[PDB]
Design a binder for this molecule. Structure first.
Ligand code: CA
Length: 375
């Protein structure tokens, strides 16, 4: 509908046809109007972003580390039962909890029905919003949480776990058995739900997410791609070493790993294993997954990085990423579509251009690359 009420009355037909009952729908939509804050967040295309080292510095703030250590102690019994029932490490569950909602203190203060209805009505991604909105109404119908307390982010990520509704409906858990999968008010349900999702995503208990390594001179930096996986044994026989020199973790020699270079060839390097891939299913950002792994390590006194971060790491702005793609294509290094997203295709083009200049081909673009391109 053109008006929100028109859209709502029309959607009410689809909800009824989808199994939602009248009391639930009307209860859920009582007083609901579009939220301009949600529209703005949905439209937001940030010109500037922070370098990875600053993101990590925030994620690994000692205050978050110590709060996670406090949660590990406070909820030790539950975490033990969860760690044991789902075969997922407590430290990883708690790290995700820290990264997703600050252990439940920052869930958002937006009503999920209002936010998803707003996006359905006038958002850029109405298919997603409609689907999640129907899923949310089913959660209300089942009674996991009262409508008044169904809180989450502008995009519909809910509660302590920041599950979207369809993820809640497939992976949320009722830990205590009261019949409610309450990822808003129950740490037990939240922690078990997180573990269930990590396990479904392939978590292997006790296996490292990954670790920092040292690269040899003249290394083939084109190998730094999550789609490229090699047994640790193959990486070691290739020149890769433990971060302080020497061999890599034995016993794990058969495990498949990828090389991650979050700030290019001058920055630190990590080998990341299957459990890193599991974390990516929670949030598909390598920076996020690195933060989760290092935060989990930090609880036990690890998590800090031996290799120095490049001082000159000023990330390309959004318009600069678009400019980069256009400049690459102009020199015959096709990056695919010009969308401002540095994905696999663009990294391929970047590497070809770096090689043309005689630079290490790490696929990591910098202002200096853009400056060279526009001589
Ligand atoms: Ca429960």
């Amino acid at each position: 509908g053109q008006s929100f009420e028109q859209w709502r009355d029309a959607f009410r037909q689809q909800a009824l046809a989808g199994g939602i009952d009248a009391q639930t729908f009307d209860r859920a939509f009582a007083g609901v109007q579009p939220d301009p804050a949600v529209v703005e967040a949905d439209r937001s295309q940030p010109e500037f972003t922070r370098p990875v080292w600053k993101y990590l510095e925030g994620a690994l703030d000692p205050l978050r580390v110590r709060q996670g250590q406090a949660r590990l102690a406070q909820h030790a019994r539950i975490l033990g039962e969860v760690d044991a029932r789902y075969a997922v490490d407590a430290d990883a569950v708690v790290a995700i909890w820290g990264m997703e909602s600050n252990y439940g203190s920052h869930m958002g203060n937006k009503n999920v029905i209002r936010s998803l209805a707003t996006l359905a009505y006038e958002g850029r991604r109405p298919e997603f919003a409609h689907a999640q909105l129907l899923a949310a109404l089913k959660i209300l119908q089942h009674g996991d949480v009262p409508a008044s307390f169904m809180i989450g982010s502008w995009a519909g990520a809910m509660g302590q776990t920041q599950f979207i509704p369809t993820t809640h409906n497939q992976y949320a858990v009722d830990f205590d058995g009261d019949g409610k999968r309450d990822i808003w008010g129950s740490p037990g349900d939240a922690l078990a739900s997180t573990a269930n999702y990590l396990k479904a995503s392939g978590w292997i208990a006790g296996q490292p997410w990954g670790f920092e390594v040292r690269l040899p001179a003249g290394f083939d930096y084109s190998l730094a791609e999550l789609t490229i996986r090699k047994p640790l044994g193959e990486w070691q026989g290739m020149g890769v070493q433990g971060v302080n020199g020497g061999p890599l973790p034995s016993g794990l020699s058969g495990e498949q790993a990828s090389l991650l270079l979050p700030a290019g060839h001058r920055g630190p390097a990590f080998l990341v294993l299957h459990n890193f891939r599991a974390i990516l299913k929670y949030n598909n950002s390598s920076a996020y997954a690195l933060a989760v792994g290092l935060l989990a390590d930090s609880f036990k006194g690890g998590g800090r990085i031996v290799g120095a971060w490049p001082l000159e790491d000023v990330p390309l702005s959004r318009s600069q990423r678009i400019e980069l793609q256009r400049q690459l294509a102009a020199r015959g290094h096709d990056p695919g579509a010009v969308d401002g997203i540095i994905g696999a295709n663009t990294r391929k083009a970047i590497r070809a251009c770096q090689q043309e200049f005689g630079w290490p081909a790490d696929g990591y673009p910098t202002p200096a690359l853009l400056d060279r391109l526009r001589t």
